[PDB]
Symmetry: C3
Subunit: 97 residues, 3 copies
């Protein structure tokens, strides 16, 4: 529980788009962990980033839980893809349990 997903991305998003993403990401971490939505934190922050030999769209995710896993990965990645259009092969997730 106390689940939290902080995303670092080079996507071009407006603030309102980031807010929509975070709220949605919060409901996704809720379903995925069964803790209530009221305890889920999500953040997105911009960064200049490369992955391989290009600066094409990519994302790094820090996931935190106080405490069986590719369930969370597909869920977090699909959320990223739905909001920023990032290819899943350009999304790294760090589990900090």
């Amino acid at each position: 529980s106390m689940p939290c997903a902080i995303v670092t991305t080079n996507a071009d998003f407006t603030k309102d788009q980031a807010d929509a993403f975070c709220l949605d990401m919060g409901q996704v971490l809720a379903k995925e962990t069964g803790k209530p939505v009221s305890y889920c934190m999500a953040g997105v922050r911009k960064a200049d980033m490369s992955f391989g030999t290009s600066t094409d769209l990519c994302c790094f995710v820090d996931f935190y839980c106080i405490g069986k896993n590719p369930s969370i990965s597909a869920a977090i990645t699909g959320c990223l893809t739905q909001h920023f259009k990032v290819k899943p092969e350009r999304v790294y997730i760090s589990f900090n349990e």
Copy 2:
């Protein structure tokens, strides 16, 4: 030692306000750990963020120490509250020791 607090927040702050916060946070990590101020790092960076069902003011803190704990938590949180006005129930801290 080598204590470091990196804060991700959706607070609206000017650069000079962030600098004041970081310097003050450095003296707080100093008192709290007894390492000298010269070795304390603090950072604040903006992010779009939600906690629960709102984007109201919240903060995530990554604390690092090369190496008995709610002493650090209350201290870091009270600093955040003094500078950004964040409610303590909207502050998550990650201890990375």
Copy 3:
């Protein structure tokens, strides 16, 4: 492998300078780990930061590897110094293996 260096700095850089840094940092994490460049992620993001009693130029690095070390440190730091002019004594690196 899956090596990734995310940098938080208070350096004043243009976006194109950050991109150059990230691409170069990717080739450096490649040499250093022998994984291919195609799997290396680097990011730089701005932050207001203090180290000691000043807000002079400093950097925090989160290094991640799925998995003998000051080889990576000197390499990452020298890259930071070549691009942002940060003094090596103002660069903290966190190894998250």
